[PDB]
Amino acid sequence: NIIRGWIFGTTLDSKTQSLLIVNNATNVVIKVCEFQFCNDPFLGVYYHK
Amino acid sequence: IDGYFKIYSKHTPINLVRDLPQGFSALEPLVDLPIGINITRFQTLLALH
Amino acid sequence: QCVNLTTRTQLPPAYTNSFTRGVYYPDKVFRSSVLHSTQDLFLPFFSNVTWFHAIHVSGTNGTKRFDNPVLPFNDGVYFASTEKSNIIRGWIFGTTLDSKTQSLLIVNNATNVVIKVCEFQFCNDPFLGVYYHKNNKSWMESEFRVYSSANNCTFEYVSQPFLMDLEGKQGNFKNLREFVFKNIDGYFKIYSKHTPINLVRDLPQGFSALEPLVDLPIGINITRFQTLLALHRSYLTPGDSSSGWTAGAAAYYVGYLQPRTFLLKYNENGTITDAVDCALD
Amino acid sequence: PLSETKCTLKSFTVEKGIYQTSNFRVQPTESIVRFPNITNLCPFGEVFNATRFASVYAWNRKRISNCVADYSVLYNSASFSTFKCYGVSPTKLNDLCFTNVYADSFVIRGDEVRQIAPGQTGKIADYNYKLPDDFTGCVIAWNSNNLDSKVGGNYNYLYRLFRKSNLKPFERDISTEIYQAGSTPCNGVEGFNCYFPLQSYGFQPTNGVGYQPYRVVVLSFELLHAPATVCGPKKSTNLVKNKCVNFNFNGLTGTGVLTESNKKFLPFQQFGRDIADTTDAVRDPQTLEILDITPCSFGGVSVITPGTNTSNQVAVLYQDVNCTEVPVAIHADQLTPTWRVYSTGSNVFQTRAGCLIGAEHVNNSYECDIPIGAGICASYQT
Amino acid sequence: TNVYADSFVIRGDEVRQIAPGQTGKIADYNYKLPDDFTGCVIAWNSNNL
Amino acid sequence: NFNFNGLTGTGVLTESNKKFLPFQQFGRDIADTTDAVRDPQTLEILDIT
Amino acid sequence: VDCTMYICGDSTECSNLLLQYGSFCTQLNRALTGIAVEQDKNTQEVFAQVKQIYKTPPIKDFGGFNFSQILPDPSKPSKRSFIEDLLFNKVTLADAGFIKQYGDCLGDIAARDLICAQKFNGLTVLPPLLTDEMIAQYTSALLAGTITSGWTFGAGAALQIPFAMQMAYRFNGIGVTQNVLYENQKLIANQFNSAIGKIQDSLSSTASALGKLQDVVNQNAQALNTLVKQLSSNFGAISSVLNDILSRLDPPEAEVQIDRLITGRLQSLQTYVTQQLIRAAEIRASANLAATKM
Amino acid sequence: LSRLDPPEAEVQIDRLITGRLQSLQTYVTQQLIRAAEIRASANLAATKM
Amino acid sequence: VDCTMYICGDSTECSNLLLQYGSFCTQLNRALTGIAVEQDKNTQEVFAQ
Ligand SMILES: *[C@@H]1O[C@H](CO[C@@H]2O[C@@H](C)[C@@H](O)[C@@H](O)[C@@H]2O)[C@@H](O[C@@H]2O[C@H](CO)[C@@H](O[C@@H]3O[C@H](CO)[C@@H](O)[C@H](O)[C@@H]3O)[C@H](O)[C@H]2NC(C)=O)[C@H](O)[C@H]1NC(C)=O
Ligand SMILES: *[C@@H]1O[C@H](CO[C@@H]2O[C@@H](C)[C@@H](O)[C@@H](O)[C@@H]2O)[C@@H](O[C@@H]2O[C@H](CO)[C@@H](O)[C@H](O)[C@H]2NC(C)=O)[C@H](O)[C@H]1NC(C)=O
Ligand SMILES: *[C@@H]1O[C@H](CO)[C@@H](O[C@@H]2O[C@H](CO)[C@@H](O)[C@H](O)[C@H]2NC(C)=O)[C@H](O)[C@H]1NC(C)=O
Ligand SMILES: *[C@@H]1O[C@H](CO)[C@@H](O[C@@H]2O[C@H](CO)[C@@H](O)[C@H](O)[C@H]2NC(C)=O)[C@H](O)[C@H]1NC(C)=O
Ligand SMILES: *[C@@H]1O[C@H](CO)[C@@H](O[C@@H]2O[C@H](CO)[C@@H](O)[C@H](O)[C@H]2NC(C)=O)[C@H](O)[C@H]1NC(C)=O
Ligand SMILES: *[C@@H]1O[C@H](CO)[C@@H](O[C@@H]2O[C@H](CO)[C@@H](O)[C@H](O)[C@H]2NC(C)=O)[C@H](O)[C@H]1NC(C)=O
Ligand SMILES: *[C@@H]1O[C@H](CO)[C@@H](O[C@@H]2O[C@H](CO)[C@@H](O)[C@H](O)[C@H]2NC(C)=O)[C@H](O)[C@H]1NC(C)=O
Ligand SMILES: *[C@@H]1O[C@H](CO)[C@@H](O[C@@H]2O[C@H](CO)[C@@H](O)[C@H](O)[C@H]2NC(C)=O)[C@H](O)[C@H]1NC(C)=O
Ligand SMILES: *[C@@H]1O[C@H](CO)[C@@H](O[C@@H]2O[C@H](CO)[C@@H](O)[C@H](O)[C@H]2NC(C)=O)[C@H](O)[C@H]1NC(C)=O
Ligand SMILES: *[C@@H]1O[C@H](CO)[C@@H](O[C@@H]2O[C@H](CO)[C@@H](O)[C@H](O)[C@H]2NC(C)=O)[C@H](O)[C@H]1NC(C)=O
Ligand SMILES: *[C@@H]1O[C@H](CO)[C@@H](O[C@@H]2O[C@H](CO)[C@@H](O)[C@H](O)[C@H]2NC(C)=O)[C@H](O)[C@H]1NC(C)=O
Ligand SMILES: *[C@@H]1O[C@H](CO)[C@@H](O)[C@H](O)[C@H]1NC(C)=O
Ligand SMILES: *[C@@H]1O[C@H](CO)[C@@H](O)[C@H](O)[C@H]1NC(C)=O
């Protein structure tokens, strides 16, 4: 369960609306917003020990 | 297409080691999202360990 | 209250070939990709099955027969039926099938399933039935004439409410209902499988194994049993309670179990796909 | 059948011979109407009595489901000057179910109402809101001149004037990136050849008609190809099996004989199609049973005719009827059906060519005349 | 031939409902033309009468 | 080491692809030794090596 | 063809509109009828040449010759010869000598059964006037005629002639002296008897020789299957289904869509009939030669 | 295609497609008729050979 | 005959519309093929005796 989502859009930047689809722990969220995306976006799991 | 972001899908069990399996199946309609946006490019979202 | 049906045409029994039917999963164990040798009471392969052809409603010289005889239980019973309209609904298992001792009554009636063990005073010619027609096209069930009385009831089980399809149909048989009934050391064990069919005349040739279904903790002596069928009654077939009826579209088969050893074939998913009757030849 | 032959041949006289006639047909006797278990009325109030409409610049899209499209509820107090349906004749709305239904909502200027239609051009058609070439829905609009108007002007209503390209159907774009013109680089600052892309409307109560605000509702939907969650006000009936009937299944009409099927429709498939794209099975909307639909008409008929200038008696051959009185079962509700013949007479003869009714049969043999088929011929005798 | 003139007063928004094939409270409950109407329709704004 | 509903033993537990019927709690290999179990809290199938 | 059913099967509005293209629906029927008439006449010209139906003689002593695999086998329920059973068993017909009942299509099967599907669209098949048994009687008669009288069974009263003499005369006809037959009578009979067995064995082994007959059958089946498949075409219409048109459109709009489909369906039928007529001319030519050769 | 939008162009295209197909159907039909005649000639020629 | 080229030679929009009566385009070629095959057989029957 590593591949969790996609970003679909024009420039994938804050200038216009774009579509973000993410399967995160416990839910699925879909939004269309003027997102200020990270150049190197990611999700992640850390806790152990 | 024409205001909709159409997504088709299928989930199939595999036991492969290296690459896309050879085989055939057809994907089901799943969903039609009424989102009026211009998608020119996209980005894949992965989780880190 | 019960009534003897007096319009039955007197016809002979039929007999058929059991082929490879009557096989069931020997235990609650997952096995796969293996051939396994076991021993139990099974319907022998290619055995002599009595065919209770029971759809004789046809003809000018009508052959109407509603066949619900008492048959021996022996060492266990193989039962199977083919139907299109939910006619074969139950069984009576017991000693004399009379009020002198406790016996087991299993009936699938409209909206529920009831199992009881009682000192039942059974009817010599028990039946269930559906009558209502004309004012609206829905069929409605109202008759239950299996026993006149009962007492000393134990093991009372009632299932949950549901709806039942009562309408009679034309065309082929649609539902194959295969069962194995055994009475061992306090338990009445019932195995079953429900398979879609599209046959016209007799038990289909083929193979499947029945699943465990249930173990009923009923300490009774079953020596014989009787099959319970529903009647079709309507405005179209006038008469009093002994004559104003027709047979419905269903028929059944009875075979007997014998001790045998088998080689059973479990495929990669643990499904029994084949078998060898070691005593067949 | 003899008169049918006379009509075909445009004559009151038919020569001795064999004539073909129309296939044996029966008529339907009752109609079956089936709709999904929808108890609610559609949100006509929310759609037409909204406190606010979006500007055309950034129009809204409401999803509609699990309701009755009883359009007549608007007859008491709504009034629409503008109305046009594209994918359906409006007189059919009450017999249909609708699916994948959405209502677009916005305000435009009155002279711009004409630009909503597909195939139109202009600043709204090109930069604010567009319908596809093959739009299958219907458009409603009205003159809200006492709602969306303000004495000093209503500046809450906006439209796009500039874009570098045209919109595609059903797109929205809320970008305020400043429009650059004339190959004159601009860093987001209004000025020579640099414009804020949006402009406001006036909509004062004192303006003439072309400048009054209008509310536009666009109903976008599909018909007959998917399960529906929205349907008209027609009431259902009970369903009758193994009879020749008329029917309406979620707006899909036709006639035929409904029989139980063994086809397994996927959860999203409401209707099927045969090898030549004709519906041959449906999923019932109240109980998800699959029924096959078989036509009522079938077989064939031919008529054995002596010259009509000699006798008006004919014999009739049925191509799909055996006529052999084979014993059959008694259905508890139904009476044993008859042969699909027009009439059963005093003389019924069965052959490989089909059963023949009305000709006497003999065990003799003779020279052929008026050939029937499969070894059989006939003649007129005293 | 067989010439008749029908005559009535309606609300201006309802003028469009006169044509055959239209629906609405006038088209459905007050006055309707046939699918195969062979005539001609005239209307005007009597706002001072 | 382990105890699965009273059935004890030792070994390495790995995820399996065996499909137990709803009434089968334990399986057996070709020489009648348990080689897979259905976990009692979550119905996962584990192979025992 | 029920030219109404092919176009407006079970559709009232379509049916009334279709009344306008009247004499044309009838004209197609006349053309097909003419073909049907010729098919029985062709059969009659080839086989029903002699009205004297001779029984196979009780005497099988046709010199040293056998002919038993040519002559009808009296022990069979059929009136066919051994070779004829092979010819009949090898050519595949969709069915023969059987009538499908309406109730037989009341199931899923109607969509898989091409005969049923064709009937529901107005396409039917007419039975032949002469049956296999009658044809077998005609071939039987011709064989009895030629085995006993040979040339003289026709053009006058049949005259019995000893078989060896019949062949002697046939040899004289070729121009081979009669002396050869008598001197080599056993050789000739053995070569013949062997040759017939070889044909029968050849027939049992390879059915490809019958491909011409199989093709006639297949071509008619294909033409009818084509008419069914063509029903799916829109022809400029929104949909090829009358019910979709009727459900969504009012009369004046439905009429346009209906006319587009009616024209298209008519083109399919007109094309069909034309092809059947062309094929009919070709089968007649073959039949005429076959009758001539008989 | 240049002057009309798709839905209007479709009408014009359907007229031409129908037309062209009718022309091809005429062609094929005439070739089939001629083919029957050439076969007859060939059969006669073969007989004479 | 390339029945597509004859109708929609080098034209995409036309070509897509032409796909609806597709079986017909195929049947025209089948008929022509039958003629073409017979033409070689005619030659063989006349000369290759
Ligand atoms: C069309 O579907 C039927 C029915 O199958 C059921 O419904 C389908 C729509 C799917 O949802 C299926 O997942 C579902 O089971 C198919 O008939 C069935 O085929 C299977 C094999 O794939 C048969 O299983 C066999 O069972 C015997 C006895 O246990 C074993 O010995 C065999 O090794 C094998 O496991 C199954 O019995 C059969 N069902 C019936 C009632 O006969 C059908 O094959 C399918 N058609 C196509 C083209 O896929
Ligand atoms: C027409 O009817 C005869 C009569 O037979 C009965 O009715 C048939 C429809 C069928 O149901 C038979 O089983 C009934 O006995 C048919 O002749 C029968 O043919 C079948 C098939 O070969 C054979 O099994 C029966 O024994 C035959 N019965 C008798 C007494 O002849 C005939 O085939 C029917 N023709 C049709 C339907 O085309
Ligand atoms: C996965 O996404 C969901 C949905 O966005 C997160 O849950 C939401 O958390 C916000 C916190 O401000 C609440 O206001 C929402 O009501 C919550 N939504 C639901 C459906 O519960 C969830 O926390 C995210 N997962 C992780 C691991 O962070
Ligand atoms: C059906 O008929 C049988 C007789 O053939 C009935 O059996 C008898 O019933 C009476 C009571 O009415 C008893 O006194 C006899 O001892 C019974 N005889 C036998 C041999 O059992 C039977 O009761 C009838 N059943 C119904 C429902 O009418
Ligand atoms: C089918 O059997 C059920 C169970 O015996 C019948 O329902 C019972 O009716 C009695 C009436 O005295 C109630 O006391 C029980 O509580 C009911 N049980 C349940 C589970 O509801 C039912 O009426 C029978 N069906 C028909 C058609 O008569
Ligand atoms: C169909 O009609 C029958 C006949 O009226 C209804 O069954 C009757 O129900 C009443 C109680 O309301 C009983 O007193 C009668 O004895 C019943 N009739 C018979 C013949 O037993 C039946 O409920 C109706 N069904 C539907 C779905 O409306
Ligand atoms: C089975 O039921 C019978 C009733 O048919 C029981 O008979 C009892 O007999 C005594 C005799 O002294 C009476 O005082 C009781 O009143 C009777 N009971 C009833 C309910 O009538 C018999 O005891 C019961 N047996 C068992 C094991 O329960
Ligand atoms: C839209 O709003 C109007 C009011 O502006 C509603 O019409 C009123 O309905 C009530 C009954 O609920 C009547 O007593 C009033 O007389 C009506 N007012 C007028 C001016 O006619 C109308 O029903 C609402 N429409 C919808 C679909 O909710
Ligand atoms: C969808 O986005 C693309 C990519 O940005 C747009 O295409 C560009 O448009 C700009 C002008 O705004 C031109 O300068 C670029 O040269 C175009 N690039 C390409 C590859 O064509 C496209 O116009 C947008 N579509 C809509 C409807 O806005
Ligand atoms: C013609 O040839 C057949 C064989 O092809 C001869 O009949 C066979 O005789 C043997 C005797 O042992 C039988 O076993 C075969 O079954 C017979 N076959 C057939 C088809 O009948 C026949 O006698 C010969 N007749 C003449 C006149 O020569
Ligand atoms: C003509 O050739 C045939 C063979 O093609 C000769 O007949 C065969 O002779 C052999 C001699 O060993 C026999 O075993 C075969 O049984 C004969 N066949 C038949 C059908 O009889 C024949 O003798 C030659 N004739 C002349 C005049 O030369
Ligand atoms: C079963 O036994 C009876 C004994 O009367 C016999 O007549 C019948 O043929 C047998 N049937 C089979 C299927 O062996
Ligand atoms: C929906 O089902 C109920 C029974 O649960 C029935 O009474 C009602 O009439 C059905 N509905 C509609 C919308 O017709």
Author numbering:
A (entry chain F): 99 to 147
B (entry chain F): 197 to 245
C (entry chain C): 14 to 294
D (entry chain D): 295 to 676
E (entry chain E): 393 to 441
F (entry chain A): 540 to 588
G (entry chain F): 736 to 1029
H (entry chain E): 981 to 1029
Question: What wording appears in the published article?
Answer:
The loop reaches into and induces subtle changes to a pocket on the adjacent NTD compared with the free-trimer model. Residues Y145 and H146 in the binding pocket appear to switch positions in the loop-bound state, resulting in a salt-bridge interaction between H146 and D627 and potential stacking between W152 and H146. We also observed minor displacement of residues 68 to 75 and 248 to 250 surrounding the pocket. Imaging revealed trimeric spike proteins present as free trimers or as multitrimer rosettes, containing as many as 14 trimers with their TM domains enclosed in micellar cores of PS 80 detergent. Alternatively, the loop that mediates interspike interactions may play a role in viral viability, consistent with our loop mutant data.
Here, we describe the structure of a leading SARS-CoV-2 S vaccine candidate (NVAX-CoV2373) based on a full-length (FL) S, residues 1 to 1273, which includes the transmembrane (TM) and the cytoplasmic tail (CT). The final construct, SARS-CoV-2-3Q-2P, was also modified at the S1/S2 polybasic cleavage site from RRAR to QQAQ to render it protease resistant, along with two proline substitutions at residues K986 and V987 in the S2 fusion machinery core for enhanced stability.
